Design a protein around this ligand. Sequence first.
Ligand SMILES: CO[C@@H]1[C@@H](OC(N)=O)[C@@H](O)[C@H](Oc2ccc3c(O)c(NC(=O)c4ccc(O)c(CC=C(C)C)c4)c(=O)oc3c2C)OC1(C)C
Length: 188
Amino acid sequence: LEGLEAVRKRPGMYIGSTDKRGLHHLVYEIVDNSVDEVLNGYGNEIDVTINKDGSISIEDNGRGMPTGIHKSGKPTVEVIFTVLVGASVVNALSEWLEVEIHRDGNIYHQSFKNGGSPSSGLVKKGKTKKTGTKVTFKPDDTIFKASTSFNFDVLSERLQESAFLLKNLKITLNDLRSGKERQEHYHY
Ligand SMILES: CO[C@@H]1[C@@H](OC(N)=O)[C@@H](O)[C@H](Oc2ccc3c(O)c(NC(=O)c4ccc(O)c(CC=C(C)C)c4)c(=O)oc3c2C)OC1(C)C
């Protein structure tokens, strides 16, 4: 509704602050959704990838988000990313967000743009034998005026802590950006 605009007006009210700590909290919110699923009993691997264009991917091997109709009459995946930390907050502060779900033998995809406005509905794009959810968002430069570039070392301390706090959970962090390519993995 106007709820996505509200986040875009006072981001600090929803995230912790409107700085580099807030920008990295967008990533932690998406990782927390995969941790929730690990704790639900499904999944043992989380992959975080900093893409060449400055977007970030968070991939898991959980069951994959449910695709049915939510109590509001609207599809579930759409509700999660558009209704008010919450994945809707990430979506509001992103110039673009994409979801990819591997569930019930199928691959579902849904795209959002310019602050969380659905660019498409949930679309069946192929078939799979793999399960899980992959979220890829690009934070908005008009919100984080100073910077939108993720810091490998900042993400790494937090993912290390999540891997230590949970146990039997392999967290991999990757950086694809030109000249600063790095790969790390954490498992306790
Ligand atoms: C951002 O989405 C998050 C998820 O994030 C990720 N990465 O998976 C995750 O944190 C969590 O994921 C859930 C949260 C709830 C369910 C959930 O409620 C499910 N269903 C069952 O637990 C279930 C278990 C037994 C059973 O007989 C039925 C039948 C269903 C009926 C009668 C409606 C359903 C299910 O399959 O997957 C679920 C999943 C994957 O919640 C979201 C969707 C907000």
